[PDB]
Amino acid sequence: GQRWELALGRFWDYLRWVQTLSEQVQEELLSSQVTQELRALMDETMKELKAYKSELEEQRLSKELQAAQARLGADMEDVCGRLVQYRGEVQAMLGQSTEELRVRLASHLRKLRKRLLRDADDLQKRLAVYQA
């Protein structure tokens, strides 16, 4: 276990739910609830990571960590941006079927998640070294 790791897992779990694009997710995507929920989980994750690095200081590499940290932050934002895009494309469809939009979202979302996953594992690996 590890605080920032647990917070990241909550964001992770939340996003995996969104990926399902179930009825409740779809309702929520058309409000700002999903992106607000994610923004909070994202903020918590970044807060904990900052506290964690700060404490690790007490036991080039810093700029590589700061940037792997940045990658994660940008990946989380990219996801939300894609979610905002979806709400807008739905509005633009003027009530017309969104199934096609959802197929496309799911596939893109899957890739943005794969990215986030690889940047979190990298960040973890650098930390595991910074550890000791």
Cα–Cα distance, 74 to 3 (Å, whole number)? 20
Cα–Cα distance, 118 to 132 (Å, whole number)? 22
- Which resolution, in Å, applies to this structure? 1.8
Which 3 state secondary structure label does DSSP give 95?
coil
The annotation status of 16 as a binding-site residue, yes or no, is no
Cα–Cα distances in angstroms (integers) from residue 43 to residues 72, 82, 94, 118, 129, in the given order: 12, 18, 34, 19, 24
Where do we find the tokens 């079927």? 97
What is the count of structural domains for the chain? 1
Cβ neighbors of 98 (< 8 A, separation 6 or more) are 90
The annotation status of 126 as a binding-site residue, yes or no, is no
Q: After which residues is the chain broken (C to N over 2.5 A)?
A: 59
The annotation status of 10 as a binding-site residue, yes or no, is no
Structural domain for 77, as ranges: 1-132
Experimental method: X-ray
The annotation status of 113 as a binding-site residue, yes or no, is yes
Domain CATH for 34:
1.20.120.20
Is 97 in contact with 56 (CB distance < 8 Å)? no
